[PDB]
Amino acid sequence: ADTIDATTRLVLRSISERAAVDRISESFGRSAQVMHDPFGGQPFPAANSPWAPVLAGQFDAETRRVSWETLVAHGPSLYRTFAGNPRAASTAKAMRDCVLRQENFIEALASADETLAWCKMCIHHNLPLRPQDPIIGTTAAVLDNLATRLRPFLQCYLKARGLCGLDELCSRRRLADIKDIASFVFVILARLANRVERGVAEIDYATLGVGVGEKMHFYLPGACMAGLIEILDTHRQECSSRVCELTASHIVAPPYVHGKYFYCNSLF
Amino acid sequence: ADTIDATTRLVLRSISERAAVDRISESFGRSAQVMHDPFGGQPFPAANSPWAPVLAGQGGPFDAETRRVSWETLVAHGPSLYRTFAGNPRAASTAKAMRDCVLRQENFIEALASADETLAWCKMCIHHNLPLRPQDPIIGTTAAVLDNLATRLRPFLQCYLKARGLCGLDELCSRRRLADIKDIASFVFVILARLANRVERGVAEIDYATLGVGVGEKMHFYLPGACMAGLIEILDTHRQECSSRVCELTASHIVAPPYVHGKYFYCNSLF
Ligand SMILES: [Zn+2]
Ligand SMILES: [Zn+2]
């Protein structure tokens, strides 16, 4: 019969023996210490780089904003910085992974666009797509973030479109399944993340839906953000579910209104 | 061959034709307006309820210290809130929808607290021999705290679970077997996955066995606060058995989330 074994039950209760405010502050202190100088004195070289501000171990969207034209011109420089500094890149990748997994909804949308715009730029210049660089390497993080936030909404929305469920889209990972902006974002990110996870040497352009001799003309920078905000707004015109309208609305307008009832902690 | 069809490419490119700063302000306005009075005329009745503060469309952010209860207080006052949930299905569905959104956007410490809130609530129901109902706002949003914690801890747990000789995160949440529980991490994810599964299957009431509790038993193995205390602990101690620098970095940044590095640009050509 399936059950929690006796010894494990003791392990779980024994948590109380080592739980205390003091112990918590000491444990936090050790993690805080790690975050003080994570690059350990081997940051990205920033000499003569236009990306120096974001290469340092020192984020405001508007402050770090670039036009597409600027990304085309200076993109290769950042690409070369990533490729030429493996230790810093692994550091950066680890940190970026955590950032993307805790970003709010608007921030997550921007990270999705940062990812695809970065791929668009590489394809524009006929550069290989490098799974090991910090941006492509953390595709799964923004995918996971967006899936967690949008899953309830997409359960209804994707049904209205007559499309596969979110889980199905992300497991099938077929270009042929893309029929709207939601399926585009999740299928492409899922395809990209899957290639990264398998540890391929480089990522085929077809992964991004780009054929031989073509470029990523069907994606414009900002489309993830603009597109997903729009359907969160417009789906209510075709849907009679109040629960759905609340869900869509609260994603777009996140200030807390209701839903927490108590905090109970007997241990510290 | 596998390709993005031409019709869909038209749809995708047309996003630009409608994208504008104004349009975004208008859309945000419509969502903000819904959130002005989400219970829309049918709030929880709160007369002579000790839970009145958290039953209204509150005016400001949830305060963990103000809304703190001892286990003894939860046992005493729990049945009242339970009765309010069960007695007001329309208000409860509204509450459940909002809580689901909250839990899916909470930060790591908040997520831990919501896991304990969920399990302590279950333990209180079991204490009183009350049915576990999927329509209950707290039980009903189990999947939300599950998804959030999984998103945040997945890279850490890949290494940690392997060191403990346990199943992977995905396997744990797929198999959903009590026999796979051998530590706090597997406990939290297996139990939440089991509970979330019963919720989505729309059962009348959820068997206590779902939470690993047999006939007449009281969930002795769970102490309120164990999710938060336990998971904070392993994020601290795993580095002692693991030689990986980047794993230590991952664990530390989860515990200490202020931004340091990792974002490179913002590019939006549409608005
Ligand atoms: Zn809907
Ligand atoms: Zn490790």
Author numbering:
A (entry chain A): 242 to 299, 303 to 512
B (entry chain B): 242 to 512
What's the publication's text?
Here we present the first crystal structure of the folded domain of ICP27 comprising C-terminal amino acids 241–512. Subsequent model building and refinement were carried out against a native data set extending to a resolution of 1.92 Å. Complete details of the structure determination and model building can be found in the Materials and methods section below. The structure revealed two molecules of ICP27 in the asymmetric unit with clearly interpretable electron density for all residues 242–512 of chain B, whilst chain A showed an interpretable trace for residues 242–299 and 303–512 (see representative maps2223 on Fig. 1C). The ICP27 C-terminal domain structure is a homo-dimer, each chain is composed of 10 α-helices, 3 helical turns plus loops. The most striking feature of the dimerization is a domain swap comprising two segments that are separated off the core globular domain and interact with the dimeric partner. Firstly, the N-terminal region containing helices α1 and α2 (residues 242–275), adopts an arm-like conformation and embraces the adjacent globular domain. Secondly, the C-terminal tail of 13 residues (500–512) extends into the dimeric partner and becomes clamped under a lid composed of residues 297–311 from the adjacent chain, and also contacts residues in helices α3, α4 and α5. The structure determined here however revealed a different binding site: each ICP27 chain coordinates a single metal cation in a tetrahedral geometry via the side chains of C400, H479 (via Nε2), C483 and C488. The metal is not surface exposed suggesting its role is primarily structural. Early analyses of the ICP27 primary sequence suggested the presence of three KH domains, however the experimental structure presented here clearly shows that ICP27 adopts a non KH-fold as it lacks its characteristic features such as β-sheets.
Herpes simplex virus 1 (HSV-1) ICP27 is the signature prototype of the family, and it is composed of 512 amino acids. The C-terminal globular domain found in ICP27 has homologs in all herpesviruses, hence has been termed the ICP27 Homology Domain (IHD), whereas the primary sequences in the unstructured regions are poorly conserved. One major function of ICP27 is modulating the expression of viral genes at a post-transcriptional level. The protein functions by interacting with RNA via the RGG box in the N-terminal region and also binding to cellular proteins to promote the export of intronless viral mRNA via the TAP/NXF1 pathway.
